[PDB]
């Protein structure tokens, strides 16, 4: 047997960041010096080990999370980082030990009008605990006065769209991200 990485990478449709996907792996040796070259990869950074001595190891359990963010937000998928995405969408723990993979997908997840399938959570009262996935679409209460689930002033829908135009700058273009955990 081998390890399936074509599944989580070459998947035809990807997940939104707030509702990120987690795939488990329970296999034999995995080809990591071989992913570094398996394609071009605008980001390939590991926070637990030298990338060349991954093939010379195997683990108790390995997870692959995938989602889409914006490029200037890819820097947030790393330990000890704060911001709109790490606070409210996908936190990595501080002792995170693993590797972070991302690449431009302007031709896949954009459309000329602007592809809006992909969402993020903008409002939350508290930060996410690491490896937390919060999927509630409950009206966010910005005020003293409570909402009871009606959008209005100080009563905001917590999820907002990404506007993905092919016209965008690199920071605002969609990047697909895969996070290998150990």
Partner 1 sequence: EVQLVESGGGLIQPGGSLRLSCAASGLTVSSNYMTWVRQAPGKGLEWVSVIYSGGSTFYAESVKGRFTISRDNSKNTLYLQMNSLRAEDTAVYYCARDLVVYGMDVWGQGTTVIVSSASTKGPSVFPLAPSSTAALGCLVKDYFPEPVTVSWNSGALTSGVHTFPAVLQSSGLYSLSSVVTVPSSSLGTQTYICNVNHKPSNTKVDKKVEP
Partner 2 sequence: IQLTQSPSFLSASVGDRVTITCRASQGISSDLAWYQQKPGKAPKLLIYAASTLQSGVPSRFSGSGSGTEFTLTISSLQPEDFATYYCQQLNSHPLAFGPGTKVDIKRTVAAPSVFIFPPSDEQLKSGTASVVCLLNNFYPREAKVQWKVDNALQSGNSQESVTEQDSKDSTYSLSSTLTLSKADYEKHKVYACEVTHQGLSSPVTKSFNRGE
Query: What residues numbered 71-110 form the site for partner 1, per CB under 8 A?
Result: 82-84, 87-88
User: Per rule CB under 8 A, is residue 156 in the interface with partner 1?
Assistant: yes
User: Per rule CB under 8 A, is residue 80 in the interface with partner 2?
Assistant: no
Select from 124, 84, 90 the least CA-distant residue to 19.
Answer: 90
What span, in angstroms and rounded, lies between the C-alpha atoms of 162 and 14? 14
User: Per rule CB under 8 A, is residue 129 in the interface with partner 1?
Assistant: no
**Candidate ranges 6-14, 24-32, 51-59, 136-144; the one touching partner 1 (CB under 8 A):** 136-144
Q: How many CB atoms lie within 10 A of CB 116?
A: 12
- Helix runs in 33-134, H state only: 35-38, 71-74, 84-88
What span, in angstroms and rounded, lies between the C-alpha atoms of 52 and 36? 9
**Candidate ranges 46-54, 97-105, 111-119, 152-160; the one touching partner 1 (CB under 8 A):** 152-160
Q: Point out which residues bind partner 1 (CB under 8 A).
A: 82-84, 87-88, 122-127, 141-144, 154, 156, 160
């Amino acid at each position: 047997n081998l390890c399936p990485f074509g599944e989580v990478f070459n998947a035809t449709r990807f997940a939104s960041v707030y509702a990120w996907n987690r795939k488990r792996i329970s296999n034999c040796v995995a080809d990591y010096s071989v992913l570094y070259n398996s394609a071009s990869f605008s980001t390939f950074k590991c926070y637990g080990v030298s990338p060349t001595k991954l093939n010379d190891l195997c683990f108790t359990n390995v997870y692959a999370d995938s989602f889409v963010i914006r490029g200037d937000e890819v820097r947030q998928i790393a330990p000890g980082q704060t911001g709109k995405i790490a606070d409210y969408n996908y936190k990595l723990p501080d002792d995170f030990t693993g590797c972070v993979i991302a690449w431009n997908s302007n031709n896949l997840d954009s459309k000329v009008g602007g592809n809006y399938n992909y969402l993020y959570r903008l409002f939350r009262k508290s930060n996410l605990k690491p490896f937390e996935r919060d999927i509630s679409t409950e009206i966010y209460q910005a005020g003293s006065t409570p909402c009871n689930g009606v959008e209005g002033f100080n009563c905001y829908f917590p999820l907002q769209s990404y506007g993905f135009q092919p016209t965008n700058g690199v920071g605002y273009q969609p990047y697909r991200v895969v996070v290998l955990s150990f």
